[PDB]
Structures are given as structure tokens and as C-alpha cells.
Amino acid sequence: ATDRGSESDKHFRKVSDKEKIDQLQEELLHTQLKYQRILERLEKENKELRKLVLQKDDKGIHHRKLKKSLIDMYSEVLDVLSDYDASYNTQDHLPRVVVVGDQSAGKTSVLEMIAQARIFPRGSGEMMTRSPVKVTLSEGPHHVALFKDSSREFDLTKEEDLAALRHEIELRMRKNVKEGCTVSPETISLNVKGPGLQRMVLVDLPGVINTVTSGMAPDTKETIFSISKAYMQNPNAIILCIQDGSVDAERSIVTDLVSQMDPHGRRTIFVLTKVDLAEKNVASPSRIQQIIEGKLFPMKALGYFAVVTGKGNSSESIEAIREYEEEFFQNSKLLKTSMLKAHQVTTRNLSLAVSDCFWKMVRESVEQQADSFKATRFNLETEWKNNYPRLRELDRNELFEKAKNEILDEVISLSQVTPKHWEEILQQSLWERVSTHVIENIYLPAAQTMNSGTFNTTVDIKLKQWTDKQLPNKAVEVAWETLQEEFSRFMTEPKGKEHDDIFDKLKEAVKEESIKRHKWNDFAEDSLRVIQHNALEDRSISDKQQWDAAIYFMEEALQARLKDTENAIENMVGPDWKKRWLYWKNRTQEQCVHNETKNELEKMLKCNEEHPAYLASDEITTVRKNLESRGVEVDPSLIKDTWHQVYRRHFLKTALNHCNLCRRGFYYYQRHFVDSELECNDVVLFWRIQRMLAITANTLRQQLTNTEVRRLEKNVKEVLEDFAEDGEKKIKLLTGKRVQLAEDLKKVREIQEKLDAFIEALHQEK
Amino acid sequence: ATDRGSESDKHFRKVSDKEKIDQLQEELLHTQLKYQRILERLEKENKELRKLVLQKDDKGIHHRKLKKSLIDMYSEVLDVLSDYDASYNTQDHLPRVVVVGDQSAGKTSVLEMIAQARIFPRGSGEMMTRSPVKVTLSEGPHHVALFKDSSREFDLTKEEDLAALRHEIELRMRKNVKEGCTVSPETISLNVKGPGLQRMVLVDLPGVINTVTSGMAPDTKETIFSISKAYMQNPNAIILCIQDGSVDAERSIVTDLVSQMDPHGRRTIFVLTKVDLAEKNVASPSRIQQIIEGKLFPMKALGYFAVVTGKGNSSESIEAIREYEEEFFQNSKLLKTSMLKAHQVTTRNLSLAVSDCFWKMVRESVEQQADSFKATRFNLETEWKNNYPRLRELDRNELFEKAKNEILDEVISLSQVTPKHWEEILQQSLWERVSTHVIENIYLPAAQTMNSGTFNTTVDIKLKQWTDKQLPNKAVEVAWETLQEEFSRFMTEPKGKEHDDIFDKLKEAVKEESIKRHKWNDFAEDSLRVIQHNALEDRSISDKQQWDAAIYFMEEALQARLKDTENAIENMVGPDWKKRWLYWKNRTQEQCVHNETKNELEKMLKCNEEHPAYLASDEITTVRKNLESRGVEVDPSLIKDTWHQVYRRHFLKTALNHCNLCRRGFYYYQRHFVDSELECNDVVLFWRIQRMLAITANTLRQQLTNTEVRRLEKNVKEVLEDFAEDGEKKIKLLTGKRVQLAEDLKKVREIQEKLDAFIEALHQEK
């Protein structure tokens, strides 16, 4: 009967087991015992195994070394840096080649010709030219392509495999775009290999635009720039600024972006596309020599190159395009009249220049960056040691788990708090809540009568009205606030050295929610009405022990109000004479007037202690007249306030003297002696109220401990589950641990492995 | 001009003038202008006295034989008896002729022939009388009818007015019947005068049914007879029995009710109807003659009569029916076979017999009952004066108006409550709501710090949370509860022996409706939220007196929690040993364990006075196992609670020693050199909350006295108007003797006033 919810939960949990354990033991623990082992065994091994199955096709020799071309391995290096941190802050560490240019300028054809195959999709000319791809370029004995995330190898000399390759890229391309924008940053990684191909890694970035039309979002112009600027920021990047040769160089759109990362083109190269279509330029030195020497641009490049990107056909084969490129420059005026120099034309020269710069800087850059990221682990280890004693047990999610368990443990302990303490809290709160009605409305008007039956009748009328209307509602409010306040205390107590600040954030979020998901059963108001009456209903003090308990409670309740009245009267009337000459506590004029009015009312009460609270109005006038006659200024309001305080003091102190006489009054009632003024009936009232306070507190406690506290535990578990699923709450609560710093120390281990193995391969090839 | 009484008066004059031209007053003027014309222009015509002169002529010398007719006064006498008592008992005091008959027997045709006008509901084969109608017949040259309740006179010689009268009677009959029922007792009073009419009050009664026909509602069968009895039982009345003599008499039912109501035929007159129809459809001798002879039924009669009611046509005139009557009784069986008496047939003989018997019965019974009605008015005087010697003929509507005035005056008196009274109640309640939280949540954790900045940080955390989410919600509860409670008290608490409780019921009824309709304004919570904050935000104690008041307030709080802690300790640890020798009053076993734990914990605090408020699990275990070594049986919760009490005792006594220290120097606080030097953040804290509580109380008081009390008065006026609308809401408590007794006194005086002139006319006119 003390608690019932836990029994129900255990019962139905056992029933669920009895019916479904032959499945639940298999699903819940059997497999899960090995679950931590499974993760490595299942997926990781698989990714390795299929790779071996592909490598087994090659049939490489054991201990041969030189397993892969160095650049193919540097592709993994760049990929691991991208995965660890995709922000430019980490991209800046290693060399890259950026392929950027005006929208639909043929820059994709430039990259594909460098790659010696039509590897990227060109389905459309609007949305398919404004999305990123990345391709590594490697030496090989055969032109073959392989994705990071696929075991399939693509034959780059056949239309079917090139089409499938373009299809996979396209499937990634047409989805890695914000809706409407059609432009979003994302990584697609392909490794393209073959004879004649250099040691590079090229990133094709969304085509650059200057205006927006009805078929595109207005933000599209800015988003492209944001992507375009992201990879250009790399100080170790070679930026291929690819411009459509059919339009004025002064009108280049990409240039105005490149100048934001390299204001003078120090690390940039100029690429002139559509050379065999822009006849107005390739046939005239006055434009070409400025465009290719670096006089028509603000950019002073690493080099300047001219290429043929296709004769307006977005789907033209790369092989035909390269053959036509080699034929065109010979056909064109440009070679004869030396407006373009032989090393400034065709795919070969551009590829070789960018390859030499990129790969030299790659060799030195990884030799540097292996130690850079290893040094970053050493730098991460100084901070982590200094911040906390070396420890990695905790985690952000584990903070939620630990605060959850702390909260549920405190809620349970709350449910098993010694009940007696619950009743003590409820009893004291109830008395503080009710004493105002007890004395001001019930006792004060009732005990002024000259008949015990009228005392009890006034008391009982006020008690019936009060126990029916306000008192039950007040008791229910007290119980609600008691439960919520004790819950708050358990959630927040700074338990000395055993307190943890980190969890506090959750304790506040749950404490608020758990309270709002609980409501107290309103029916209590009616039950209390009955119960309260019953506790009052006992008016019979049968023996000395209950007589003394009754007198005790009456003395306590009346002494509190008497002390309050006496403090008010002391402030109102002023200091005594002793203070006035020993501490020079001189009275104010109001205090003197109040003192004289008090003296008038007090002589009246001293002569006749039976006087009721209410005077005649002509009595007020008489008091004013006498006070004025002696020389005291007084008005009916001063008399009424002084009268109220003074009569209450007289009333309560007379009640306590009646306590002093009740303590030794029993003979009068044995004898029925007629001259006996003493009748001790207030004692019964305060006895009844003490017992009613006890009964109300205990009933509220029982409702709390068997019905409401278990509902609170259920609501708290619901709140904790809802917060556990909420990722945002975990992000914005329980954030204090230093584990985040250690996560970098551990995660950069992939970058550390790729870079060191690349250094070893560098030495092996040399 | 500032603080000048005359200037204040002039400002008040301006403010009152603007209110005098308020939109309320302007709309009152605009609506009043139309109202002066609406329900107006009657007055100028009313001034003429010609109508009054005609009424005087009717009352005094009407210069025509009709004047001062004694039967005419008897009609008013019976009407005023009906007014005195809806219940039949008193209406039975005075004679009248009550006419009952078989349903659809033609009784209304008989009553029309006697009244000589088509003034009764006439129809073919249908219930004609459904609610009884009392028509009084008197002689006069003007054959005119007039309702008791109307001013329209109906000319009884013309069909338009006769039909209007009949259908108005039908409508009144229906309006006396509840929806879904057909028959009702309420009597319609029509005064009919014309030549040849006899002095005869005649009461048509709902037709009696052997059984309900299917179309008719069943109700009638029980209703009809009861109604008939109500009028039939009159010991001073004549029974005129109308029976259908053209049908099998075995099917008749009226004679059974007549025999029940007059077993001896003391004033019973029997009449057959439909005699002309009976000529071809005569009721067989074997059943009808035994009725005429009083043998089939106990009914005896003053004579057995018969009249013709027509041939079933509803439009038949009086003269036609009488002619047909004469032909029938000359030629038909009712006389030739000697059932009915020749002097007892035809309309004239029945009318004359009824008038003679009626007026002799009147002369004999009305004088006795008129002396008895003088006795009746003195009898009402006897009881009434005893009931209400001070007040005579008081009515519930008058009482409601008086209560409305008193209650609105009580609201105004509530406005008169001094502002300090409201502020005192509000502040005391407000402080009761937070002080425990002030120490438990702020002071205890704040005062344990080694850095007063964290003391103040704990202060500010708790105070800011409470101000943002709690204080503006507690303050409004305190204020609106305070207004409700004081509103209740002004309306109920007697001002000594001079209190009049007559309107206490009405006051209580107004109270709940007014409070429910009225609300405390929503805005308050925001303003309080700001105001409270600022009162706390100011941390600077302006002067020494304020600093001392802060220390006194702090001493109150700390002393209260210290005494509570000490009493809780005595509750758990049990009696002292000195108490054992003194009163033989010792520790219980649990109290023994508690005290031993307390002594060990007090040793701990003696060794370390700065021990933190929280015992760690190792400290708790040290206490547990040391007491177990002592043999005392201790557990972690016993020690946790005993430690809380003991430590708070130590902490609060130290806080009161600091109270004493802080008096000398606020500057020592300003120094903030070291903990040993005075560190009185405590005094400034209790000062800040002093300001918060006082300003909250005064803001609540101001909104009360300038916003909510006037809204309360408006709501009370509205509620008292709703009181005006509902009379039941005036007699919700069944103590209504006042109104009923007043009405009875006035109506009995009218009864006797009319009976006096009637009896004098008996002495003189006859």
C-alpha cells in the first residue's frame, strides 16, 4: 500500500517475458553480447574483403612494395583530411588543384581532357554545370576509373563504362544541391588512371555566374561564390581560372572571385576555352597576346594556356576533342604569328605545368603535414592534460545518460523518503496557510462572547463554510507545492563535495518539464472536506493528556498572534520611558497620541475585561472628546486602528491567562458551581485544529506517496526519454566535458596513417 | 500652489466637470431625449377627468336602476376572496353557484341561456369547458360584459363582440393550462350585466368524463374531477348538475361526483340537457328516472330540472334554443311520463330557482362569514404583529432594493479601507510566501561560501529566477485573495450589537457572483515582474536606519528558522535528562538513537565550526559505524536529517551572532578585506527583499484601490441588477413570510371592506 506502481511494472514485465522470452532473449542479449565485436567484424572487414577480391584480379607480388602510384595514395590523403575536417581551415594544409571558370565555359571539358576521358556527366547545360565533382589523376598502364565508394572499375576507352561512370557521378550531382538553388557544396571522389596522365587532384567547382534568371534562385549567385571561394582559399592550391574565349576578357566573371583569394594571381593559371570558336580573338594578336601574357587581366599567373573544349557539343567525345585541339592550333593563325606560344597551347602543356608544381609541392607538403597533424596530436595532448587529469571515460551522450540516471535515482529516493518527513512538511505548511482563518475569522469573533455555546456556534458556522469552500482547496495547493518543491530540492541540492555541476543543465530542463506534465487529482478537495470535518468532529477532551495537548496548541497559536500584535503596538505607540531617558528614544507626535488613546482604551478594558471588540460610534466621539480635552488630537480612524490592535492584544493575553487557569481547572465542572466564570472551551477548538492539521497533512502525504509520486516518476521517465531523443537538447545541455578536445587527438589518427604511408611510398619510388 | 487645499478643490472641480460631460452622461442625455417622447403624449390625454367622472357615476349615483346593485358587490367580494387565497379552502368560505356537467352535455348553452348571451365556448361534440369560468349575473339595461383583468367592454347584443369575448375566454382558458395538458383549475372572472338577469354567481367547470377519449390527453380524467371537487365541496355553494338526457344514462358520470360533493342534496339542483335531441333519443326510463328520483345515485336535489341546449349546432341563438325548449316540454316524454316536474323545466324556471336558492343562501351565509372575515383580518393582525412588530407589510422586492443599497455601500466602504491596511496585509502575506525559500534556497548555500561573490551569485540566481517566473504570479494571488477576503469581511462581520443581519443572505449571494464576474487585471503580473526586480536590483542601503531595519528583518527570519530547527531537533532526539528528573519524561528508542547521533555530530561541529552543510557518504558512514560501536543503531537517513537540523541550528546561531556583529560598521562590509572582517552581504540581502516585499505590497494596494475596487463596484451593481431580474433568486432561501404576510394583510382588508358594504346593502336593499 506504501507504493503500487513498481509492482505493476514488475508484474507486466514478467508477463511479457513469460509470453515472449523465447524471442526476447535472442533479440535483446544473445546477439547484443557480441554487438561491440560485430561492428568491426561485419562492415569493416567487408569493405576490405571486396577490395582484396579486386586486388586479387591484379595478382600483385608479396613484399614487392610500390603497390600503388603515389598520387593515387595522395588521393586517400586528401580524402582523409576532407573527412576529418571539410572546412578550408584544414584543406589549407595540403596541395590541391581547383578547376573554376565561367558557367558552361568548357572547364569540365578542360578537366576531362586532362583526365583523357569523358568522365563527368554533361546531361544539361544549366544545372549540370553548377555542381562540384572531384577527380584524382594518376599514371597507369590502362585507362581505368574507380570510385572511393564502389568496387566497380570502369573502362575509359568504351562508351558503356564511361556512361555508367558519368551516371554514378550524375546520381550524386543532381542530389547534392539545395532545392531551387541547384547549388550545394559536397564531395564526390573518383580516381582516374591511365597512360600519360599526371600526378594531380582536380576539383571541378560550380560554374560562376554574374546574373540570375527566372529559372534559378536569386541566392544561386552567392552560393556558387561561397563554394568557389572555399577551395580557392587554399594557399597551396593551383587555381585554374577558366574563361570563355568567345567573350571579352574584361567581362570575365570568375576573375572577380579569384582576385578575392589571390588579388594578383600569384598561385593562379589562366585557361582560355573555346579557342576554335572564338575566332575574333585567336585570329588577332592585339587580344591574344594581352590575354595570354597577363596584360589583359589583373592576374599575374603561374602560366597561361589555351585549349579546345568542344565545338558547341556538350556530349562530344574527349578523344575527338583532343585530336581536333592538336589539329586546330596548327591550322590557326596563332602558331604562325606567335600570339600564342607552343608551350601555352593544348592539354599536354597545361597538364604538365600544373602537374610539376602540384606534385613537387605535394612531396614536400606531406613530408611536412604528417608531422604537422602528429604535432597537432601532441598540441591536443598538452591542452587535454592541462585542462583535466588524463581521462577519456566520459562523453557528451554519456553526460545525458549519467544525468538521466542521477535524476531517476533521486526521483526514486524521493518516492522512498521517510513518509513521516512528508507529513511534517505538509503539517507545518498547512498550519501556516490556515492560521489566518483559524484566528481572525474563527477564534477572534467566537471567543468574545459570554456563552460557550455561542463560541462553539460561531466557530462551527465559520468552520463549516471554511472546510467546505477554502480549506480543501488550500490543502490541495499545499500538497501540490510540497511535492513539486521536494522534487525540485532533490533535483538541485548542492550535496557538498558529491555534487556535479556538469549535469545541472539537464536537472533544470527536466525539473521544469516533469512538473508541467503532472497534475494533482482535484477530487481530493471533496475527500479532504469529509476528512477534515471528521478530525474537527472530535470535540471531546476525555482526560488530562489531551487537555494538555489542547492547551499547548491553543497557547502556541494565540502566542504567535499576540507577539505580532505586540510588535505592531510597540511600533505604533513608541518606546517606554526607560528607553526615552536611557537611550534617548524620544517619541514622535503620532506615538504620543497613540499612547494616550491606548491609555483610554486600556483603562476601559482594565475596568471591564468583558468588553466586546465593537464600541459605539458615540463611544468613539467620547474617546475623541476626552483625548482632545486632555490635549491629544484624535479622530475616529486613529481610534479604530488603535482599538483593533489593543483589543486583539487584550483578547489574546486574556486567552493566555485563561490558559494559565485551565491548566488547573477541573473542580468547577465536577461541582457545577454557579459563581465560576472560568469555562475552558477554546482549548477544544485548538485541539481539534491541531488534529485536523495532522489528518490533512497525512491524507495529502498518502495521496502523494501512493498515487501522485508514482505518476511523477512515470512523467519524469517520459520527459527523460523525450530529451534523450532530442539531439538539440543534448547539444545545448550537458556540454561541459573536455572529451571534445580528446576526440580530435584520436580522430586525426587516419590523417596520420595516410601521410606517413605516403612518405614511405615516396621513398620507395625514389 | 502645491500642497494647497483650495488648489486641490479647484482641481477636483475640473476633474468632476469633465466626468459630468462623459460619454456615459452624453449617451444618457441622447437616449433620454427620445425617451421623453417614447411612452409619452399619453399624459396630456390622461389629465382629463371625464373617464373618472363616469367611473364615479358607476360607483355612486349612476342614475339608472343598475346602480349600487348588491350582487355587483358580491362579485367583487368573491374576486377578493380568490385573490386572498389561491387555495380552495378560503374561496369555499362564501357562497356561489357551481355548475358541473357531463362533458359535451351542452352546459355552456345552459349558462348562455341563463346569462342571455353567447358568452360561453360553444362547439359541436367537443370539450367546451376546460378551465372553470366564473360569470356573475346582475340586472341592468345595458347588456354588457367586462373582464376582471381588462378595460374592454363587450356588447352582448352583437356577434362581433360576443365572438371576441368567447375566443378571448378560450385563449385565457388555454393560458391557464400547462403545455401538454388540457385542463386547469384557474378561474376566469367575467362580470356580465343585462336586463332580466338574476342575482347569480355561476361557475362553469371542466366537463367530467366517464373515460378519456383517445384523442384527449389522459391527464384530464384525474385533473378534471379534482378541479370540480375544489369548487363543488364549498359548503356554502349550490351544485347545479347538468346531465345529458339524450344518451344512455348508464354512461353518465357527473351524478357520482355530485353525490360525493353533496351526499344529501342540501344545495343541489339537477338539470337534464339536450332535451330536444332527447325527444328522438330519450334516455331510457330504467336509468334516467332513477337519477331524477335520486335512486340510481345517492344524489338528492332541490328539484330535478331540464333545459334544451340546441340540436348540436354551435351558432344557435338564445331565443331559438328557448323556443325549442318550449316545444319539447309541451310535447315530449320528460313530462308526459312524469319524471321531471312541470314547474322545474324550461330556462326561466331553472334560472329563478337557482337565483332564489342562491340569494337566500347568500343572505344566510355571507353575513356569518363576513363577521368571520372581520375576525379573519384581526386574526391576521394577531400573528403578523407578533411576527414583525417593528416592521409592517414588508415585501421581498423592497428587501432586495435595501440589500442592493447596503451591499454597494459596503463596496464603497471597502474603497474607504486605509491604504496602509491593504499594504500591510499584502506585504505580510508576501513575506510568508518567500522567507522559507529565502533561507533554504539562498541564505544557507550562499552564506557557506569562502568568496562573497559566490554568496551574491547564489542570491542573484535564485532571486532572478523567482522574479522572472514566480514573484509576479504569487503577488497577484495574494492581492486578489486579499480583496476577496476583505470584501467578504465587510459584508458579514457585525459591528457589535447594532448589526442587522436581514440582508446577510443577499450579501453572501452577491459576493460569489460578483467575485466570479470580476477579475484582477492581467497587466499586473508584468509590472510586478519589473517592479520587484528593480527593488532587488538596488543593492545600496541609503542610511543607518535602513541598515538597522535590515538587520532586524534578518534577525526575524534567522530566529524563526533557528527556533524551528531546535524544535525539530527536540522532536527527533527526545527529552532531556533534566526533563527525565523534572517530569519523568525520557527519550524513546528512536529518540535515543537520534540524540546519540546528534551528540556525535555536535562534537564534529565543535571540532570544525566551518564544516559544510552536507555530510558526504564517508562522513555519514563514520557516524553510522561509530554509533554502531557505541551500540546505537544508525542508518544514513537518520544521520542526514539529524545533521540537517543540528547543522542548521549551528549555522543560524552563527548567523545571529553575525547579525549582532554587523550593527557597528556598514563600512567594515564596504571594506570586504577578509572573512574575519565583517562580511555583511546578509544584511544587504534582507534589505533588498525588504524593498521587494514592500514595493510589491504597495503596487498591489494601489491597483486594488484605484483600479480593482471601482471595477468591483461596477460588477456588484451588475450582479445586483441580476438579483433584480429574478424573484426566485430573492426567495432562494424559504423564509418568505414577510412578503406573503404583507400581501395577505392587504387582501384581507379589501375582503372585509367589500363585505361590509355588501352586508349593509343586505340590511337596506335586499
Curated annotation (Swiss-Prot), chains A, B:
Impact when changing S351R: In DOA+ and OPA1; decreased GTPase activity; loss of function in promoting mitochondrial fusion
Spans annotated as G2 motif: 127-130
Intramembrane region list: 577-587
Mutagenesis or variant effect for Q465A: In interface mutant 1c; strongly decreased ability to mediate mitochondrial fusion
Reported impact of T108N: Abolished GTPase activity without affecting the ability to bind membranes
Reported impact of R41A: In interface mutant 8; strongly decreased ability to mediate mitochondrial fusion
Region of interest (G4 motif), residue spans: 273-276
Effect on the protein of changing G245V: In DOA+ and OPA1; decreased GTPase activity; loss of function in promoting mitochondrial fusion
UniProt effect for mutating L49A: In mutant control 1; does not affect ability to mediate mitochondrial fusion
Effect recorded for L745P: In OPA1; impairs protein folding; loss of function in promoting mitochondrial fusion
Outcome when changing W581A: Does not affect ability to bind and bend membranes
Amino-acid positions noted as binding GTP in the UniProt annotation, renumbered to this chain: S104, G106, K107, T108, S109, G123, K274, D276, T309, G312, N313
Designated name of the protein: Dynamin-like GTPase OPA1, short form
Source organism: Homo sapiens
Gene: OPA1
Region of the whole protein represented: 195 to 960 of 960
